[PDB]
């Protein structure tokens, strides 16, 4: 299954280097800028790579919803995470001409009783989400737990 698509050559190369190091089989889709990898490893690998810093309405909505769902699924592969919800809020093509807008994301996680996300895991989530959405800076990702505690500084 596709690990990543639409990668820069630089990111692609970095991702391939990491996969080789981890001894994970991979197949870079020919001229598809995509890297199909073991289906059962896709989510774990996305997270791991994120930790290393790598890399119509209805459709949009659907797309957005699909993206949200995928991101949630990936985040749920983290050990301490029981469930995750991702909400993406990219304003519709800035109607206002002068004012400038920017995409943001809100991530809510339900943690396993007695478990917490560490700083690394938190950073991985933030990176994963930011990388998935064009123009979404890490700073515009808010990560909260079930109790509403802000995890991202």
């Amino acid at each position: 299954r596709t690990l990543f698509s639409n990668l820069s050559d630089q990111d692609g190369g970095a991702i391939v280097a990491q996969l080789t190091q981890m001894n994970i089989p991979y197949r870079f889709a020919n001229g598809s800028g995509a890297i199909e990898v073991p289906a059962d490893k896709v989510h774990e690998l996305r997270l791991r790579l994120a930790q290393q810093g790598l890399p119509q309405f209805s459709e949009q909505v659907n797309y957005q919803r699909a993206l949200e769902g995928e991101l949630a699924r990936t985040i749920e592969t983290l050990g301490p995470v029981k469930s995750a919800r991702v909400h993406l809020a990219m304003p519709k093509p800035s109607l206002f001409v002068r004012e400038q807008k920017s995409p943001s994301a809100s991530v809510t996680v339900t943690l396993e009783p007695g478990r917490a996300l560490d700083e690394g895991q938190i950073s991985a989530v933030v990176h994963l989400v930011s990388s998935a959405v064009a123009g979404l800076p890490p700073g515009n990702v808010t990560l909260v737990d079930q109790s509403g505690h802000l995890l991202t500084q």
Binding site: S147, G148, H149, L150
Partner: peptide
């Protein structure tokens, strides 16, 4: 410049007070 920093400071304070209220009002 400085006004934006002050406004962000106010926004963070308000958000944290909001979260503290929500934390006890949730259970």
């Amino acid at each position: 410049d400085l006004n934006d920093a002050q406004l962000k400071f106010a926004n963070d304070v308000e958000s944290r007070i909001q979260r503290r209220i929500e934390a006890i009002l949730s259970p």
